[PDB]
Amino acid sequence: DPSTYADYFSAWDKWEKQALPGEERDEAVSRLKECLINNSDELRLDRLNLSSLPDNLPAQITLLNVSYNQLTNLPELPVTLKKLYSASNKLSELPVLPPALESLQVQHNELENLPALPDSLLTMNISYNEIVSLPSLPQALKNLRATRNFLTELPAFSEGNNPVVREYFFDRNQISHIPESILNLRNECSIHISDNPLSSHALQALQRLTSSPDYHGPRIYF
Amino acid sequence: SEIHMTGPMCLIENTNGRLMANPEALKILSAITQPMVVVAIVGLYRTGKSYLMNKLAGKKKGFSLGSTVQSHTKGIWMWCVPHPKKPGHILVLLDTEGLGDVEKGDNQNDSWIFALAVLLSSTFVYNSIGTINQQAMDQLYYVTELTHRIRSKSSPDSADFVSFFPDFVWTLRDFSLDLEALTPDEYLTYSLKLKKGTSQKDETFNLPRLCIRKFFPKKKCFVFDRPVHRRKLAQLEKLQDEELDPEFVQQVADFCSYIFSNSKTKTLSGGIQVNGPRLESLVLTYVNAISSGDLPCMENAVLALAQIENSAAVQKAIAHYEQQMGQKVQLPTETLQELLDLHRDSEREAIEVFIRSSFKDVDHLFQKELAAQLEKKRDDFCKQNQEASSDRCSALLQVIFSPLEEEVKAGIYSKPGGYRLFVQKLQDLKKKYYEEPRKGIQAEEILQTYLKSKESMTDAILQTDQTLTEKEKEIEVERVKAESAQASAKMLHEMQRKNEQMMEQKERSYQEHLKQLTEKMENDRVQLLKEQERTLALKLQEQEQLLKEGFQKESRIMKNEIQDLQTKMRR
Ligand SMILES: Nc1nc2c(ncn2[C@@H]2O[C@H](COP(=O)(O)OP(=O)(O)O)[C@@H](O)[C@H]2O)c(=O)[nH]1
């Protein structure tokens, strides 16, 4: 069911020789070689001018760094992955994420839609993209970074019962409306929505709502 | 007062989402008297910028991996060493801790780290790995944020950047390409050429080149050579580096020999030679503007630096006045013009000390506060003069007239001829009083105010000494009323002239203020003109390069940006 060592080298030496000019596939192979043998949990393929990663990544790793490359689409990811580092690439859409993932670094890409989000996600950064609407928001997910984007709504999807949360960022967007699902959260949340063109009546509807005994309300910043 | 840093210290740290300036780095900053040549070496993760900084100072024949046992997760490092080729100046080295979410993310605020290195530096060094390309001009997106990151002037934008931005230096790591036609400077100019067109991909790829061209006055490029072992990490070896740097050390020793003899001293608006405390107020006012939620402006930073050095220039001006008057004022003053002339002379030097140590006193509030404190010093010096004059003329009375206060107490002058012999002795005592030297200004008042208090005894001698006619022939007691009337007149006639002389000085002082401030504001407009002429000669230097290299589309928008300056130079 899993691949073998000789199976990995064959498909990698093949992927090595389809080398675009300047593309440092020769070093990435000697790293993927070095990765598989010691069974190390970390795979670092950053700043190698890579436009397409091979379909066979060592399914034993848990940390993947392929940021600062020309990646267009990403291959299937090992279920054993914890952290995902792929920023400042040309990604268009994401393969379905492993259910064991915890962090997601995808900022500075060309994403417009997102696949399902595992509940094991604790932090992520999705800024500098072109997404409008978003899929399920996990329960333990606390640190969102969606500053630079085209989003117009924020359907904060619920789970079993979400305890204490952390700061979310939605500045510089086109939200233009706050659903009361925001206001339902208690006074331990942080929601930054600066530089978003808001509704006229809703501009002052939240001003007079927060300048009150609004002890049962989340902190809003704009 | 020499300084040679013992290992690069953190200046500002990028921690937990914001910036928190390292106080120990600011403490050693405030101790640097000499001016600074600040060279900022910025770079992404592991961009090989360490072997530059550790060479720009000259640690050894290479430095052993810098210091990785203390990798403070931060945004900027500093290293201040004495400048080798410029004698009195201090060579400051800046560096980024490494951007790109290496061990922690938070690169959210990376665009500030770039802009901060621009404002703080006099020579800007940017380290990338070879063959400036599409993937490189994408990682340099920080230069695209500058148009919205900072501002030149403040409102109660990007055009003025070329006036004060440092010189862009691009160090190409591990490139050394043998691309036969070019020279490294010709490559940086060939790479900076644009693509004519009206598409969104033309503008999105010509935009980062327009920024690096329009914003920076001078541009110089350098390259690296990269030892032949393609797998070796930070190997500590200098003889294995001599076998690994044939034309590499020749590139780095030439790059440092250029930075040493061609990097300008850090300056601000008005020829302000930036030094330790000035740089300290710079970094402090910039990060505190960021963390407070505002954009950093170079005008507000140089005004906040003005509010610091202007009030300090007032104290040095006040203190120089006190030192002068203490060694000049010979109390009690003989006249009043003697004191007022000794004041305006030491007042002139006090204004001179303030002028040379002040800059852009907004509305001259710091100069008028000095003149208000100087007028207070003017007043109490006359009041201490009156106290000094009176306290001596009074002691003269207790020694000249106290013998006569006993001759009358003993009964003399109460006999035939007693009155005319008392007056004759009083005419003599009043003469010895007037003959005593250095009495002061209160000599006339204290004498008369004492005679009008002893007039009861001058009267009691009358009607006691018959001697001759009296009793309706008391001409010499209405004569006494005549003297105590003309005396109380010339005293009031001098209280006028005294109060007149104080208004003469309240104008000769104000005329000295408007005279020295005139020469300062004159040389202020003279410098600004030269600064604008250089700024204009460089905005025309880049418009001609767009007409020369084809693009008349941008030369017209450059003429639009230049004609905006022409109207703002006027008022
Ligand atoms: N590619 C390259 N790397 C170098 C060179 N010199 C030193 N290095 C490596 O680059 C690392 C230092 O990178 P640096 O500029 O400090 O990046 P930072 O650590 O993220 O701040 C060290 O581990 C060195 O081993 C060079 O000439 N070329």
Numbering used by the authors:
A (entry chain A): 19 to 240
B (entry chain B): 3 to 158, 167 to 191, 196 to 585
Sentences from the paper on this structure:
IpaH9.8 is one of the most well-studied members of the IpaH family and is secreted by Shigella flexneri during infection. IpaH proteins function as E3 ligases and subvert the host UPS pathway to suppress the host inflammasome and innate immune responses. Recently, it has been reported that IpaH9.8 targets human guanylate-binding protein 1 (hGBP1) for ubiquitination and degradation in order to suppress host defense in cells. In this study, we illuminated the key role of the LRR domain in autoinhibition of IpaH9.8 and revealed that IpaH9.8 can be activated by its LRR domain through substrate binding.
Crystals were obtained for the complex of the IpaH9.8 LRR domain and the full-length hGBP1, and the structure of the IpaH9.8LRR–hGBP1 complex was determined at 3.72 Å. The complex crystals belong to a space group P6122 and contained one heterodimer in each asymmetric unit. Structural analysis of the hGBP1/IpaH9.8LRR interface in both complex structures of IpaH9.8LRR–hGBP1 and IpaH9.8LRR–hGBP1LG-MD revealed that hGBP1 mainly interacted with the LRR-NT of IpaH9.8, rather than LRR-CT. Similar to the IpaH9.8LRR–hGBP1LG-MD complex, the LG domain of hGBP1 in the IpaH9.8LRR–hGBP1 complex interacted with the concave side of the IpaH9.8LRR mainly through the P-loop, the Switch II, and the α3 helix. However, the IpaH9.8LRR–hGBP1LG-MD structure lacks a GDP molecule that was observed at the catalytic center of the LG domain in the IpaH9.8LRR–hGBP1 complex. In the IpaH9.8LRR–hGBP1 complex, the guanine-cap was visible and revealed a similar orientation to other nucleotide-bound structures of hGBP1, and the phosphate-cap was also visible but flipped compared with other nucleotide-bound hGBP1 structures. This difference may have been caused by the lack of phosphate, which would normally bind to the phosphate cap. In addition, the α12 of the hGBP1-GED domain in IpaH9.8LRR–hGBP1 rotated ~10° with respect to hGBP1-apo (right). Indeed, in the IpaH9.8LRR–hGBP1 complex, the Glu147 of hGBP1 formed hydrogen-bond interactions with the Arg166 of IpaH9.8LRR (top), triggering main chain conformational changes in Arg166 and two other adjacent residues. Altogether, these results demonstrated that substrate-binding induced conformational changes in LRR-CT, which resulted in destabilization of the hydrophobic cluster and LRR-CT, which could disrupt the LRR–NEL interaction.
